[PDB]
From a paper:
Here we report the discovery of a natural protein, citrate synthase from the cyanobacterium Synechococcus elongatus, which self-assembles into Sierpiński triangles. Bacterial citrate synthase (CS) proteins are homo-oligomeric enzymes that can assemble into dimers and hexamers. CS catalyses the condensation of acetyl-CoA and oxaloacetate to citrate as the first step in the tricarboxylic acid cycle. Using cryo-electron microscopy, we reveal how the fractal assembles from a hexameric building block.
Three dimers are first arranged in a hexameric ring and three hexamers then connect into a triangle. In the 18mer (level 1), CS dimers assemble into hexamers through a heterologous interface similar to known hexameric CS proteins. The 18mer is then formed through an additional contact between two dimers of adjacent hexamers. This interface has an unusual geometry, whereby only one monomer from each dimer participates in the interaction. The two participating monomers form an interface between the amino terminus of one monomer and the carboxy terminus of the other and vice versa. An interaction between the residue E6 from one monomer and H369 of the other establishes an important contact, and mutating either E6 or H369 to alanine or deleting amino acids 2–6 (Δ2–6 SeCS) abolishes the formation of fractals. In the two non-participating monomers, the termini face outwards. They cannot engage in the same interaction with another dimer without causing a steric clash and thereby passivate the edge of the triangular assembly. In the 18mer, the non-equivalence between chains allows the interaction to form at the correct angle and ensures that no more dimers can associate into it.
Numbering used by the authors:
A (entry chain C): 5 to 112, 117 to 379
B (entry chain D): 5 to 113, 118 to 223, 225 to 286, 290 to 377
C (entry chain R): 5 to 114, 116 to 223, 226 to 377
D (entry chain H): 133 to 223, 226 to 263
Write the structure that this text describes.
């Protein structure tokens, strides 16, 4: 009868978390504009809005912040386990393994809808920071109880307390990637949660799915391409080579947005401010040169730079290792996954798709003595 | 034919592994009858057939067996890592954690199709037996290089050499569950493998999503069989469960209703095992009573009702009924990953929004 | 719910005219061993057996042969039409065009005994004359009138080359044709059968079959080209290195379903060596022998054997035939199988009308100017 | 021998093997290194190779060991210093095997001869000082 090759257009579920429409360039969380929300809100408020659907009060926000701060300490058993981890592996695989192991310590009624989400939102940043410290041989750093969430994460990663403006910029960047439309990772999380086992297995499976093919990321390959460009003078030859071969130049042109998606422009403005207040460096200069040399002709076909191109530069200037790009995206991604799991917990119906068999019929086994 | 809640009946992919037929109750692996295949074939041959799609010759099977036996050893780093696991955990969560940790040691990435599958097929039973011993308290036991796969697993688990008849019965019981139609776990594994990351992640996701609510049917059926009391107490509790409008577990499969071959073949192997080697009499009494007293609703004992008994007799802990099923299903998971590696479909279902538009963020609430 | 990809392994029709083994390397025409027919049977006897299913009698065979000889004359209008053809067109396309145009002059469509025999005999007789005439025209030479004295293969060779060949060469060509007469169901045969299902006429069916027979860019000729490119035996090692590195099946060696030393290959190589010892050995045939030996000495363990196409191309080249004419020779050899399939399908009437799977969007809106 | 075999096993992530009190010296070392019991002929060949490699004249390593031992502190420090100074730059026979593998079959003999002729230097693995 009918058969869509890969669930390309079939509706999965009655989503009510976010909504994206490329025609008007609108991206709303719980039907709230992204730019207006991110203008005067923090990451915790956005997470609460995504999880519960309604803006909290000052007292509830303060209580939630206190609970988040209280649950930042990591168990020493996990630190010992990471001390027993190897070093040649990739950080995302270790993060997935640690998330899977997290379920062992915490398991097993109304309270078990609030403790799990806060624990999972709090432990993962400290966990990835501790693994990053262990990978280079340094000991983990015990988190402080006075700094902000972004400030705490930066202190864990780089053992240097950053400026408040840098913390605000990092918080804005985190809440920018807070949640997007349904994709491979989100659908995997949804199908895993359809059996209502626990948030830990769901987040482990979703992180495993999020792992890029060939163990790479879009930001990593964008940085590799920027390095392969070389000096400023060599901008034109590489760009015309990429245009000639009829291959989509990385970091230019999205798949769903062709009307200048607000995330790209807001992240570009944030990058401009951060690069102007701090040291300019040649990174921003070469980035501006190449982006202008591309957009001076790519605008004809509606190709514009995407979010990852600016996000990589922002992370590089912030002083973060290249291999840690994926976990930073994963923080906001698990923030969204917890909301998808909360939505999915209401209706109890596992996904049970059928298939059309395309094989032989009515064969027989042959003993080894003949074949 | 676009939207349907639950996503039921919508075709997903051109699968060519397992076949089903409700009206006839048949089951085939690459178009080979399940009963005939289980009668005169081993587990390794079945795994090779499910993965590569063609039966192996003598030299191929010998090389596969040699590689399996050589790679069955477990690196001591895994043992040291599993030493730190808490003793209050659950076996399936530990299995998922171990399968996730395995990715670190074998990241790598023409030959990246055969080494990964053999390593992942060999190391899983050793890891699960090691964690069972660690949770019990004793140290692990190194595997032998003479015993059969089922025999080696039994020796690792119960530290006793099993009889060849028991090894054969466990091998056939394992290969019975080697594959089934697409379900939640298989679909999740297919979605994860659509991005072609690595086997060590899709298998971890599949074993994570395989856990049922409350953390299969074997534990509950064993609990109900133990709690039924004596032979004279079969009628009271059974009619109490009938009257309370609760579906009787261990009976009435959703799709199969014509005495699927798996159930009858497992019953036959259980019968032939029990006589040569309590539970037996009470179980046959209760199943006979239920069959004779329903007789109208198409009530038939499915596979798990006797799989629980055959596992309990062989000396397996009650909690360990899930990891053995995971070990059986990992072959089908790897087969599905191998099949889906070529498609590169990249599943991406689009949702439908049912909320509001153009709201405002109030500074004070 | 079943759906095979590429319509593989589907019992399209209940054909009883040809049979293959696949395990013992047996090939049967009407359940008769290929070697037995190839030993002491002419092409016309094989064609009659394929068309009718029963071995002909002496009087019937003589009558059929005389009828074939009497209809070897081509209408002058066909020559005038082929005159206007360009000289760049590949031969098989012109053959298809001429076969399609033949239908204009014959539109009986209704006696009934005549319209089971006259059409098939004319279609079997006029094709060699047409292809030879176009071959002569492509070089700007006047077509040669056929002779009513030589044999079938002898007449075709005389028309193509104007030089009378030896009877041994004529017999070799005839047995090559009769071993190339018909095979199992393939793409061309399936297209011919589906076209004939509506029982319109044999001319359109054969035109469609010859049109779909032409492959991409119009194997044996490619094998000869590669052999010429290799040259002497000093260049064997780069060929082996290329075949090892590419990890792909070398063209002209092995069959998709036959890995059991196909019976046609040994017969064809026997005929080739007979022809080369009778008419002397040329250096390129010895080069072919050397390269095939150097291939088989290594590819034997993998189950790779020389294919019939290589020997067929070699014998055609040794017989003095242009490389571009390999496909029309295959077409005239195969034209018996298509007629047999049309005849056997004409008994029944089952129009092919399979369903389809819709993998497109279900409903959209028409943008007026946007 | 036990220490070096244990580190060899550890480097590959394998549990060290307990020594056996029944085999011979070279046999025990081979069993510890490979877990496979070797033939007595191979054990004798290894033993005689060791005994012909037992000691040589004074060289850099022996001189360092002697100068360290001059102050008669302890044998452990002396042997540690000797084994430390024994390691050459970038840690010959292994290089010979690598070069042999690089050459491959006898079809590549002539470039080796051309290189040895042109370099005008003593080819490693051939000749003694």
């Amino acid at each position: 009868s009918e058969f869509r090759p890969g669930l390309e257009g079939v509706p999965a579920t009655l989503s009510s978390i976010s909504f994206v429409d490329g025609q008007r360039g609108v991206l709303e969380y719980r039907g709230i504009s992204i730019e207006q929300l991110a203008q005067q809100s923090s990451f915790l408020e956005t997470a609460y809005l995504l999880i519960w659907g309604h803006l909290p009060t000052q007292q509830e926000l303060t209580e939630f912040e206190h609970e988040i701060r209280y649950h930042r300490r990591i168990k020493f058993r996990i630190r010992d386990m990471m001390k027993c981890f190897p070093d040649s592996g990739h950080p995302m695989d270790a993060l997935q393994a640690s998330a899977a192991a997290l379920g062992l310590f915490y398991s097993r009624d109304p309270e078990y809808i609030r403790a799990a989400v806060v624990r999972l939102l709090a432990k993962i940043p400290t966990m990835v920071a501790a693994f990053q410290l262990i990978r280079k041989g340094n000991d983990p750093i015990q988190p402080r109880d006075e700094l902000d969430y972004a400030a705490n994460f930066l202190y864990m990663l780089t053992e240097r307390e950053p400026d408040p403006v840098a913390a605000r910029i990092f918080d804005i960047c985190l809440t920018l990637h807070a949640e997007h439309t349904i994709n491979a990772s989100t659908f995997s999380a949804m199908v895993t949660a359809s059996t209502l086992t626990d948030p830990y297995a769901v987040v482990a499976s979703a992180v495993g799915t999020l792992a890029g093919p060939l163990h790479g990321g879009a930001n990593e390959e964008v940085l590799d391409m920027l390095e392969a460009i070389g000096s400023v003078e060599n901008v034109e030859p590489y760009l015309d080579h990429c245009i000639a071969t009829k291959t989509r130049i990385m970091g230019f042109g999205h798949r769903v947005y062709k009307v200048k998606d607000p995330r790209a422009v807001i992240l570009q403005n944030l990058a401009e401010q951060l690069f102007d207040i701090f040291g300019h460096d040649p990174y921003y200069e070469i980035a501006v040169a190449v982006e202008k040399a591309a957009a001076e002709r790519l605008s004809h076909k509606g190709i514009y730079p995407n979010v990852d191109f600016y996000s990589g530069l922002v992370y590089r200037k912030l002083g973060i290792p290249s291999d840690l790009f994926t976990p930073v995206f994963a923080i906001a991604r698990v923030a969204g996954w917890l909301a998808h799991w909360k939505e999915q917990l209401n209706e109890n119906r596992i996904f049970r798709p059928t298939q059309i068999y395309t094989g032989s019929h009515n064969l027989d086994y042959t003993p080894i003595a003949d074949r």
